[PDB]
Write a protein that binds this ligand. Structure first.
Ligand SMILES: CCS(=O)(=O)Nc1ccc2c(c1)[C@H](/C(=N/c1ccc(CN3CCCCC3)cc1)c1ccccc1)C(=O)N2
Length: 260
């Protein structure tokens, strides 16, 4: 299958959207990752995809181009190919070192800072959505649940993303909207915990039990592997159940663990 300048080759991943496939550009001798969406599965989307194409940061996966036959179902988003794939899948048998987790936390924070400066909240930060670049740095991927906002923050009502990474305020009977940036800090906190432990801080196969744990249980650090008191401090501030006091990106950047 040829799609303009790309030869579509084998599948490398699948989802609710559709698939991701290798796309060979012969005129460049470069492979790409082509995300093939179904329009029936998805007006407003065309505008959101156009915002995503404007994004340019070393810790955000670059959307190269969009191909579309309006008379047909498929929508093709062409991205940079990162052949090392997701940095981690949870749960896993062996986590990263604390030192390695730090380099990846720095990447995510810089990427997130950049997205928030561009008035985007990601809403699905998690290890499997962090692609490992050939330069050793992670790039934030999967913007399917992201939202653009105006002003200083997103104000949100609906829940979206991955249950195990959703902040308490997003799943609580608030009768009130919640701030989108603090959702991304929380999710990054869950992610950070996954980097050093290989498992989420709140785990349950039963969604109501998962929600209860997220809302009601404190973070419990496994006795092994041991981590630094400084990392524990950062994780507890990022997983503060109160979004009003939960640490922000500016302070995360100044945290002693991050700067050490
Ligand atoms: C989950 C991210 S997404 O929403 O699919 N977006 C996205 C954007 C840009 C990308 C990608 C995805 C990938 C991407 N790369 C990737 C995925 C899987 C592997 C490992 N396989 C192992 C089996 C043989 C082929 C290679 C290597 C690279 C990917 C696709 C689907 C799910 C997770 C990761 C890539 O290289 N660039």
């Amino acid at each position: 299958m040829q799609l303009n300048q790309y030869k579509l080759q084998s599948e490398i991943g699948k989802g609710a959207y559709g698939v991701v496939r290798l796309a060979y550009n012969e005129s460049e001798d470069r492979h790409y990752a082509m995300k093939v969406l179904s329009k029936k599965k998805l007006e407003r989307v065309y505008q959101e995809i156009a915002i995503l194409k404007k994004l340019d940061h070393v810790n955000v996966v670059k959307l190269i181009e969009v191909l579309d036959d309006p008379a047909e179902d498929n929508l093709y988003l062409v991205f940079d190919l990162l052949r090392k794939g997701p940095v981690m899948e949870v749960p896993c048998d062996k986590p990263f070192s604390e030192e390695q987790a730090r380099l990846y936390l720095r990447d995510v924070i810089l990427g997130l800072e950049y997205l928030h400066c561009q008035k985007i909240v990601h809403r699905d930060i998690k290890p499997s959505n962090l692609l490992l670049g050939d330069d050793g740095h992670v790039k934030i991927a999967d913007f399917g649940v992201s939202n653009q906002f105006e002003g200083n923050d997103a104000q949100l009502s609906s829940t979206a993303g991955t249950p195990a990474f959703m902040a308490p305020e997003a799943i609580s009977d608030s009768g009130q909207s919640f701030s989108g940036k603090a959702l991304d800090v929380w999710a990054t906190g869950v992610t950070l915990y996954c980097f050093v432990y290989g498992k989420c801080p709140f785990i349950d196969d039963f969604i109501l039990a998962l929600h209860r744990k997220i809302k009601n249980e404190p973070v419990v650090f496994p006795e092994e592997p041991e981590i630094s008191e400084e990392l524990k401090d950062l994780i507890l501030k990022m997983l503060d159940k109160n979004p009003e006091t939960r640490i922000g990106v500016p302070d995360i950047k100044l945290h002693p663990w991050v700067t050490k």
